[PDB]
Amino acid sequence: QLLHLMIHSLYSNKEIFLRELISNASDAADKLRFRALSNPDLYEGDGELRVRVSFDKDKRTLTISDNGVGMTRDEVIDHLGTIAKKDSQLIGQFGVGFYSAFIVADKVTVRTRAAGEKPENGVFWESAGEGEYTVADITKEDRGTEITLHLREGEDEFLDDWRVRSIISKYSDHIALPVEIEKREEKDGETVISWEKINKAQALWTRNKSEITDEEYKEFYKHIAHDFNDPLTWSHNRVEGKQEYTSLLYIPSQAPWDMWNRDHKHGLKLYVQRVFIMDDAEQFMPNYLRFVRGLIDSSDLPLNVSREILQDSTVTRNLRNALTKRVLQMLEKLAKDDAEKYQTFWQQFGLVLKEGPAEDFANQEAIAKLLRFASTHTDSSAQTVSLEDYVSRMKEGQEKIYYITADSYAAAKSSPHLELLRKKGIEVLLLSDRIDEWMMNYLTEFDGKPFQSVSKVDESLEKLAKEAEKALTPFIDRVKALLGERVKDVRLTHRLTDTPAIVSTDAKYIFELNPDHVLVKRAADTEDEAKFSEWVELLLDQALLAERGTLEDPNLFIRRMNQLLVS
Amino acid sequence: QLLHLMIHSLYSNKEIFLRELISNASDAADKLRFRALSNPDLYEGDGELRVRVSFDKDKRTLTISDNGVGMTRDEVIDHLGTIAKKDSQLIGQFGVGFYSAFIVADKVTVRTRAAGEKPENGVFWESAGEGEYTVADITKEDRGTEITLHLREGEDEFLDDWRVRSIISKYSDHIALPVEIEKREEKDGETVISWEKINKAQALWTRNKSEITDEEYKEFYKHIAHDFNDPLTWSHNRVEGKQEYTSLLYIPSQAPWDMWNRDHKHGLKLYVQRVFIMDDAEQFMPNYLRFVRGLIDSSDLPLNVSREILQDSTVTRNLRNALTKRVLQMLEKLAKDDAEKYQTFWQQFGLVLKEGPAEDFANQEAIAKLLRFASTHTDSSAQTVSLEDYVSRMKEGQEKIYYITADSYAAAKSSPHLELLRKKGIEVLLLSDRIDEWMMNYLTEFDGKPFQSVSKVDESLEKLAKEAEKALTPFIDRVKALLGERVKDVRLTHRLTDTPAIVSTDAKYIFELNPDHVLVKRAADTEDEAKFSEWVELLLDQALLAERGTLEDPNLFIRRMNQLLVS
């Protein structure tokens, strides 16, 4: 996680630390304001919660001091000293700030006092970034945390009133916490201090969709999803009545590490009356949409809600399905708006969506519409085509959608099953993904047209000369005598293709041959019993290798083929 | 077990029941005489233990009455009534008798009284063979068992004094228990009863090897091994001194059902001073000889011996290794005497012997000598050849014995590895058995000549023109450019054979080619880059299929080959 944190902790853009810290400042406020309810005293009278930035020209320090929830010693040791010489859940929001901060500064100093704790139990922390941190019990009367930055020789860039104020607003905007800054005017005798907020300060989601710029939207995704790839696109939707909730969903441009662990990240940030209640709550998404990220501010749920109350009760189930559609909404929408970006989304989340048709039955059609496959239309492994792109191609009588389920692209693309339809002028869905085979067990019918796998048949190829069939009946008898009962039967089918023969099965195998193939004719010219049996044995062993990719005596097949070549 | 019990319970030969019953009579005596020691009273004064046969002309019944150990009710119910409407361990000795008896008789009546039990707790048993048996508490003063046979209409054959006496001795001979029979002479007033034994009565193994006929030896194997295939051959050996023990081992002609279970049968019958002590004790064989069957009469072991004392102590370990050699002795011997019968033994026990070289290190050479493989000498899957038969073929400089380890005959026989030596004029051991691969890890060296698998190389083929090698170095470069790094290297070896190319590995793969093959020349004539790559790709994919029997994209390989054929 941190490596591709570092690449842009560079950015070359440096000033990043400030943002990331303000992020921390906010989340701090939240966790505080949350913990408030269960012990209304922790505010200690000081209820105007905020964050004040300051700086000293002579000692050359920048100084971010919030009055959130602060830290217990153990927390300072468990976090800051897990950064010196769960844990990635601290590196989550906090890591970026740390390392980034040490880009601009050469000594960093923390000075906390966790909300509620006695002012003697405050804490102190310092390091020159090296393999060494220094932590000590100290006193700090106020509540919260104070971070101070010994600036590195030659970064006076950050002592410039205008530069800082700028760098502030360039993030302060999308942030719910009042971000003040040091206004000191020195008159002779009265060196007067006051603090001015550069921030509108208002939960961005509680604001109205018109005034919220794309910037505020993107950067807000950063701050809530601990990612700094820009998001793909979002959904800011309010609701009044019984269910009065606001909700704001995003869709990431790039999928996280632990998407393919059974260890989470997922969930949405659940507020109740503009008050944080928990991060990464995962009731409000179906598991086939887990990649959804964002928050939801309900005015209906209990003020003492738990993950138990959520998971069990019913207002959740409703809230879920609603948000679900909201998301499918967002995707269909993005699908038609910026197909460039959706192609991105698909390459980044398809495999998870594909879980959907089995899970959320209700919206099954809508989900299908979102899928994006690859097909014989173009010989690229790229998964561009859609179910409409397919129906839009269909020919008369083509009442089913034809697909194949392999283990990889080249495989499916090589399969003989294809050439029947590739010749007759049809389109074939190439499902060269792991899950696909399971998917189809639920992806039964779309747009009135059912799905039917080439790897079998019924009344699909039942419709899709007879004298060659006649002479084929003497040939058939010759074969049935040649083998007998290693094969359940012998048939002559017109899976035209360029492959001679093929085994099949019902709902040992059934041997099938193609009257129109050169090898079939050059094996029909055979009277010599040696080559007769040799050819036929080759063909059977072949169709086996084609349907199982393994042979009893491989070296034998190899020997036979190599013989008929040189001769 | 019973089905191939029935086939010869037929025999057509009928009279079999009598034998099988007398068998029962003996074993009965034994278990009794054994139980005697731990409670010397059970003899009830009656110490002349025996078995008396009688018969009634008018009621038409034959009547075998032994004074062994009898049966508790529960035993009569658990055994005889497991035969009506462990358990195969009762069907072991007893089943044959039962069913056979009901061949000659139409009602059978048992009448027991288990040794020690009160005469009121005797038991009674009867049936017309059908799905119905009848058992009742009864009184019988004497100890032991009495079996009575209501003879079937038209089998008066068995009421004939001479017929019976004959049928008696035709088994009584090899049996250790005195087999008496009813001598009644009717004088007017004195209808006098006495009993005359038709049996020498003496533990056949305690007798001397000269007087014991082959009959007595074979039939005795029957009686101890509950089998009535004739044995293959045996070993009757006595020992005096510290270890004074007699021992008599056999080797079955046919291997039992449960040879290939992890549920036993094996073990030898351990006597201590001519007194049975336990059947199927398996300390006195190594597990690679478990198919050994027979008994051993020690005069040294404790009179209160357990399987614990046996397995743990040391006199066993000695006794074992001794008997072990005795068995290898017996086999070498049979190997040279009747190669017809040994071929039988091998077909019937080889796979178990083959466990040996890993287990019994001491006799490892001797064991090897016994093995019997199959080799290119003749294209039959039959495993006739031996390690001497091989050395007796060897050519100058051939310092190693060459073998191949496959999954089946045709496989190993098809392998390309062979043709190098098949051409250069050598012999190849075909090990197409499961265990072989494990065996060789211990079967390192024999008769000074080591073993070396064709499936690898060292200084074996290091010894077993250079201008073709030169031009091959331009060709090699062309190939190394064609592929690059899907193969660790490209080489040209002279594994002459008729196979073009082959991958190898050390102690991805290494690609190797045969300058002398037609396909190699017809691929050296190639300038067209399309076929150039097409040929080479084919060759690589081939050698893969040859060394793994599976391909990434099989249908592709198939397509390529089929193309080059028709074109």
PDB file of C-alpha atoms in Angstrom, chain A residues 248-412:
ATOM      1  CA  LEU A 248     -23.473  10.156  -1.627  1.00  0.00           C
ATOM      2  CA  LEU A 249     -21.833   7.259  -3.467  1.00  0.00           C
ATOM      3  CA  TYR A 250     -18.626   7.104  -5.509  1.00  0.00           C
ATOM      4  CA  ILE A 251     -16.966   4.593  -7.829  1.00  0.00           C
ATOM      5  CA  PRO A 252     -13.150   4.241  -7.643  1.00  0.00           C
ATOM      6  CA  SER A 253     -10.929   4.529 -10.717  1.00  0.00           C
ATOM      7  CA  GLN A 254      -8.658   1.796  -9.395  1.00  0.00           C
ATOM      8  CA  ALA A 255      -9.349  -1.253  -7.231  1.00  0.00           C
ATOM      9  CA  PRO A 256      -7.618  -1.666  -3.832  1.00  0.00           C
ATOM     10  CA  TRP A 257      -5.165  -4.344  -2.706  1.00  0.00           C
ATOM     11  CA  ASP A 258      -7.573  -6.188  -0.434  1.00  0.00           C
ATOM     12  CA  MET A 259     -10.405  -6.507  -2.937  1.00  0.00           C
ATOM     13  CA  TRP A 260      -9.299 -10.098  -3.462  1.00  0.00           C
ATOM     14  CA  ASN A 261      -8.749 -10.992   0.163  1.00  0.00           C
ATOM     15  CA  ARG A 262     -11.391 -12.364   2.492  1.00  0.00           C
ATOM     16  CA  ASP A 263     -10.173  -9.525   4.681  1.00  0.00           C
ATOM     17  CA  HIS A 264     -12.360  -6.493   4.063  1.00  0.00           C
ATOM     18  CA  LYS A 265     -12.092  -2.889   3.502  1.00  0.00           C
ATOM     19  CA  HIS A 266     -15.563  -2.271   2.209  1.00  0.00           C
ATOM     20  CA  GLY A 267     -18.537  -0.429   3.645  1.00  0.00           C
ATOM     21  CA  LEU A 268     -19.960   3.087   3.722  1.00  0.00           C
ATOM     22  CA  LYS A 269     -19.564   5.864   6.279  1.00  0.00           C
ATOM     23  CA  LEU A 270     -22.804   5.949   8.263  1.00  0.00           C
ATOM     24  CA  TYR A 271     -23.873   9.272   9.748  1.00  0.00           C
ATOM     25  CA  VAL A 272     -26.981   9.795  11.868  1.00  0.00           C
ATOM     26  CA  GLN A 273     -28.121  13.415  11.906  1.00  0.00           C
ATOM     27  CA  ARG A 274     -24.870  14.783  10.490  1.00  0.00           C
ATOM     28  CA  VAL A 275     -22.952  12.870  13.166  1.00  0.00           C
ATOM     29  CA  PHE A 276     -20.406  10.189  12.261  1.00  0.00           C
ATOM     30  CA  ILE A 277     -21.282   6.787  13.715  1.00  0.00           C
ATOM     31  CA  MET A 278     -18.912   4.347  12.022  1.00  0.00           C
ATOM     32  CA  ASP A 279     -16.593   4.013   9.035  1.00  0.00           C
ATOM     33  CA  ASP A 280     -16.686   1.034   6.678  1.00  0.00           C
ATOM     34  CA  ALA A 281     -20.152  -0.199   7.615  1.00  0.00           C
ATOM     35  CA  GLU A 282     -21.059  -2.786   4.991  1.00  0.00           C
ATOM     36  CA  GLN A 283     -24.787  -3.380   5.449  1.00  0.00           C
ATOM     37  CA  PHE A 284     -25.699  -0.696   2.930  1.00  0.00           C
ATOM     38  CA  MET A 285     -24.103  -2.516   0.020  1.00  0.00           C
ATOM     39  CA  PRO A 286     -24.782  -5.933  -1.510  1.00  0.00           C
ATOM     40  CA  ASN A 287     -21.592  -8.004  -1.572  1.00  0.00           C
ATOM     41  CA  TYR A 288     -21.606  -7.826  -5.372  1.00  0.00           C
ATOM     42  CA  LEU A 289     -21.193  -4.052  -5.080  1.00  0.00           C
ATOM     43  CA  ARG A 290     -18.650  -3.978  -2.252  1.00  0.00           C
ATOM     44  CA  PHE A 291     -16.389  -1.771  -4.377  1.00  0.00           C
ATOM     45  CA  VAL A 292     -18.891   1.021  -3.761  1.00  0.00           C
ATOM     46  CA  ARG A 293     -17.533   3.743  -1.485  1.00  0.00           C
ATOM     47  CA  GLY A 294     -19.199   6.757   0.088  1.00  0.00           C
ATOM     48  CA  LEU A 295     -21.405   7.855   2.969  1.00  0.00           C
ATOM     49  CA  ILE A 296     -25.064   8.024   3.967  1.00  0.00           C
ATOM     50  CA  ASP A 297     -26.682  10.392   6.465  1.00  0.00           C
ATOM     51  CA  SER A 298     -29.906   9.007   7.934  1.00  0.00           C
ATOM     52  CA  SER A 299     -32.253  11.038  10.129  1.00  0.00           C
ATOM     53  CA  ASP A 300     -34.368   8.017  11.065  1.00  0.00           C
ATOM     54  CA  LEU A 301     -32.105   5.370  12.609  1.00  0.00           C
ATOM     55  CA  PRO A 302     -31.550   5.198  16.397  1.00  0.00           C
ATOM     56  CA  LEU A 303     -28.940   7.488  17.943  1.00  0.00           C
ATOM     57  CA  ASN A 304     -27.500   4.406  19.647  1.00  0.00           C
ATOM     58  CA  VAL A 305     -27.093   2.179  16.588  1.00  0.00           C
ATOM     59  CA  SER A 306     -24.808  -0.858  16.451  1.00  0.00           C
ATOM     60  CA  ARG A 307     -23.651  -3.150  13.648  1.00  0.00           C
ATOM     61  CA  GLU A 308     -26.000  -5.656  15.278  1.00  0.00           C
ATOM     62  CA  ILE A 309     -29.066  -3.426  15.042  1.00  0.00           C
ATOM     63  CA  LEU A 310     -28.085  -2.579  11.467  1.00  0.00           C
ATOM     64  CA  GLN A 311     -27.432  -6.069  10.129  1.00  0.00           C
ATOM     65  CA  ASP A 312     -30.538  -7.542  11.756  1.00  0.00           C
ATOM     66  CA  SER A 313     -33.307  -4.953  11.409  1.00  0.00           C
ATOM     67  CA  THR A 314     -35.310  -4.064   8.313  1.00  0.00           C
ATOM     68  CA  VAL A 315     -34.869  -0.329   7.718  1.00  0.00           C
ATOM     69  CA  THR A 316     -31.395  -1.404   6.629  1.00  0.00           C
ATOM     70  CA  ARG A 317     -32.684  -3.902   4.071  1.00  0.00           C
ATOM     71  CA  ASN A 318     -34.808  -1.190   2.471  1.00  0.00           C
ATOM     72  CA  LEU A 319     -32.015   1.379   2.686  1.00  0.00           C
ATOM     73  CA  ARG A 320     -29.747  -1.179   1.033  1.00  0.00           C
ATOM     74  CA  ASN A 321     -31.856  -2.112  -1.979  1.00  0.00           C
ATOM     75  CA  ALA A 322     -32.532   1.571  -2.605  1.00  0.00           C
ATOM     76  CA  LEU A 323     -28.842   2.487  -2.557  1.00  0.00           C
ATOM     77  CA  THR A 324     -28.209  -0.602  -4.679  1.00  0.00           C
ATOM     78  CA  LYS A 325     -30.320   0.725  -7.542  1.00  0.00           C
ATOM     79  CA  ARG A 326     -28.712   4.129  -6.990  1.00  0.00           C
ATOM     80  CA  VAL A 327     -25.421   2.442  -7.867  1.00  0.00           C
ATOM     81  CA  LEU A 328     -26.610   0.486 -10.892  1.00  0.00           C
ATOM     82  CA  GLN A 329     -28.106   3.851 -11.819  1.00  0.00           C
ATOM     83  CA  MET A 330     -24.697   5.500 -11.528  1.00  0.00           C
ATOM     84  CA  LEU A 331     -23.120   2.851 -13.749  1.00  0.00           C
ATOM     85  CA  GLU A 332     -25.634   2.672 -16.584  1.00  0.00           C
ATOM     86  CA  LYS A 333     -25.302   6.459 -16.541  1.00  0.00           C
ATOM     87  CA  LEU A 334     -21.498   6.449 -16.721  1.00  0.00           C
ATOM     88  CA  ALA A 335     -21.741   3.651 -19.280  1.00  0.00           C
ATOM     89  CA  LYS A 336     -23.544   5.918 -21.734  1.00  0.00           C
ATOM     90  CA  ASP A 337     -21.754   9.163 -20.856  1.00  0.00           C
ATOM     91  CA  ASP A 338     -18.071   8.241 -20.920  1.00  0.00           C
ATOM     92  CA  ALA A 339     -17.506   4.808 -22.455  1.00  0.00           C
ATOM     93  CA  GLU A 340     -13.789   5.501 -22.111  1.00  0.00           C
ATOM     94  CA  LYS A 341     -14.159   5.634 -18.330  1.00  0.00           C
ATOM     95  CA  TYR A 342     -16.554   2.696 -18.111  1.00  0.00           C
ATOM     96  CA  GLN A 343     -14.153   0.492 -20.045  1.00  0.00           C
ATOM     97  CA  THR A 344     -11.820   1.521 -17.226  1.00  0.00           C
ATOM     98  CA  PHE A 345     -14.363   0.673 -14.533  1.00  0.00           C
ATOM     99  CA  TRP A 346     -15.001  -2.713 -16.129  1.00  0.00           C
ATOM    100  CA  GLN A 347     -11.310  -3.576 -16.351  1.00  0.00           C
ATOM    101  CA  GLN A 348     -11.245  -2.647 -12.672  1.00  0.00           C
ATOM    102  CA  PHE A 349     -14.403  -4.194 -11.198  1.00  0.00           C
ATOM    103  CA  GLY A 350     -16.048  -6.485 -13.739  1.00  0.00           C
ATOM    104  CA  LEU A 351     -15.152  -9.687 -11.914  1.00  0.00           C
ATOM    105  CA  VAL A 352     -16.989  -8.406  -8.841  1.00  0.00           C
ATOM    106  CA  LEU A 353     -20.059  -7.210 -10.725  1.00  0.00           C
ATOM    107  CA  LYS A 354     -20.241 -10.652 -12.332  1.00  0.00           C
ATOM    108  CA  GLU A 355     -21.058 -12.059  -8.894  1.00  0.00           C
ATOM    109  CA  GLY A 356     -24.226 -10.023  -9.167  1.00  0.00           C
ATOM    110  CA  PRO A 357     -26.730 -12.026 -11.261  1.00  0.00           C
ATOM    111  CA  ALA A 358     -26.507 -14.854  -8.730  1.00  0.00           C
ATOM    112  CA  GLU A 359     -26.946 -12.530  -5.753  1.00  0.00           C
ATOM    113  CA  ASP A 360     -29.358  -9.667  -6.428  1.00  0.00           C
ATOM    114  CA  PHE A 361     -32.146 -11.361  -8.388  1.00  0.00           C
ATOM    115  CA  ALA A 362     -34.439  -8.326  -8.349  1.00  0.00           C
ATOM    116  CA  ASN A 363     -32.296  -6.050 -10.511  1.00  0.00           C
ATOM    117  CA  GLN A 364     -30.964  -8.949 -12.564  1.00  0.00           C
ATOM    118  CA  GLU A 365     -31.872  -7.418 -15.927  1.00  0.00           C
ATOM    119  CA  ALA A 366     -30.305  -4.062 -15.072  1.00  0.00           C
ATOM    120  CA  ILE A 367     -27.101  -5.784 -13.966  1.00  0.00           C
ATOM    121  CA  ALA A 368     -26.888  -7.786 -17.187  1.00  0.00           C
ATOM    122  CA  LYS A 369     -27.130  -4.527 -19.123  1.00  0.00           C
ATOM    123  CA  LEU A 370     -23.944  -3.425 -17.359  1.00  0.00           C
ATOM    124  CA  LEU A 371     -21.876  -6.495 -18.248  1.00  0.00           C
ATOM    125  CA  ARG A 372     -19.271  -6.296 -21.022  1.00  0.00           C
ATOM    126  CA  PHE A 373     -17.890  -9.383 -22.766  1.00  0.00           C
ATOM    127  CA  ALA A 374     -15.498 -10.346 -25.553  1.00  0.00           C
ATOM    128  CA  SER A 375     -16.642 -12.069 -28.745  1.00  0.00           C
ATOM    129  CA  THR A 376     -15.631 -13.369 -32.169  1.00  0.00           C
ATOM    130  CA  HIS A 377     -16.714  -9.990 -33.535  1.00  0.00           C
ATOM    131  CA  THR A 378     -13.073  -9.005 -33.078  1.00  0.00           C
ATOM    132  CA  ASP A 379     -10.099 -11.246 -32.330  1.00  0.00           C
ATOM    133  CA  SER A 380      -8.979  -9.083 -29.413  1.00  0.00           C
ATOM    134  CA  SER A 381      -9.074 -10.440 -25.862  1.00  0.00           C
ATOM    135  CA  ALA A 382     -10.472  -7.029 -24.912  1.00  0.00           C
ATOM    136  CA  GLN A 383     -13.917  -7.217 -23.312  1.00  0.00           C
ATOM    137  CA  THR A 384     -15.618  -4.354 -25.142  1.00  0.00           C
ATOM    138  CA  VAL A 385     -18.870  -5.805 -26.453  1.00  0.00           C
ATOM    139  CA  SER A 386     -22.194  -5.666 -24.601  1.00  0.00           C
ATOM    140  CA  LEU A 387     -25.473  -7.593 -24.631  1.00  0.00           C
ATOM    141  CA  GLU A 388     -27.099  -4.913 -26.780  1.00  0.00           C
ATOM    142  CA  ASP A 389     -24.054  -4.775 -29.045  1.00  0.00           C
ATOM    143  CA  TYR A 390     -24.784  -8.473 -29.510  1.00  0.00           C
ATOM    144  CA  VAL A 391     -28.543  -8.376 -30.059  1.00  0.00           C
ATOM    145  CA  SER A 392     -27.867  -5.480 -32.429  1.00  0.00           C
ATOM    146  CA  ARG A 393     -25.912  -7.975 -34.535  1.00  0.00           C
ATOM    147  CA  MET A 394     -28.294 -10.920 -34.401  1.00  0.00           C
ATOM    148  CA  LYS A 395     -29.610 -12.657 -37.519  1.00  0.00           C
ATOM    149  CA  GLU A 396     -33.064 -14.087 -38.243  1.00  0.00           C
ATOM    150  CA  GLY A 397     -34.061 -17.142 -36.243  1.00  0.00           C
ATOM    151  CA  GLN A 398     -31.141 -16.619 -33.873  1.00  0.00           C
ATOM    152  CA  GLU A 399     -33.271 -17.085 -30.773  1.00  0.00           C
ATOM    153  CA  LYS A 400     -30.381 -17.748 -28.387  1.00  0.00           C
ATOM    154  CA  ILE A 401     -27.137 -16.037 -27.394  1.00  0.00           C
ATOM    155  CA  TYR A 402     -24.168 -18.329 -27.986  1.00  0.00           C
ATOM    156  CA  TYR A 403     -21.179 -18.452 -25.646  1.00  0.00           C
ATOM    157  CA  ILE A 404     -18.260 -20.671 -24.652  1.00  0.00           C
ATOM    158  CA  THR A 405     -16.712 -21.250 -21.229  1.00  0.00           C
ATOM    159  CA  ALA A 406     -12.980 -21.969 -21.283  1.00  0.00           C
ATOM    160  CA  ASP A 407     -10.023 -21.422 -18.958  1.00  0.00           C
ATOM    161  CA  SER A 408      -8.379 -18.685 -21.022  1.00  0.00           C
ATOM    162  CA  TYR A 409      -8.825 -16.553 -24.138  1.00  0.00           C
ATOM    163  CA  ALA A 410      -6.605 -18.371 -26.636  1.00  0.00           C
ATOM    164  CA  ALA A 411      -8.269 -21.571 -25.444  1.00  0.00           C
ATOM    165  CA  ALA A 412     -11.842 -20.452 -26.099  1.00  0.00           C
TER     166      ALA A 412
END
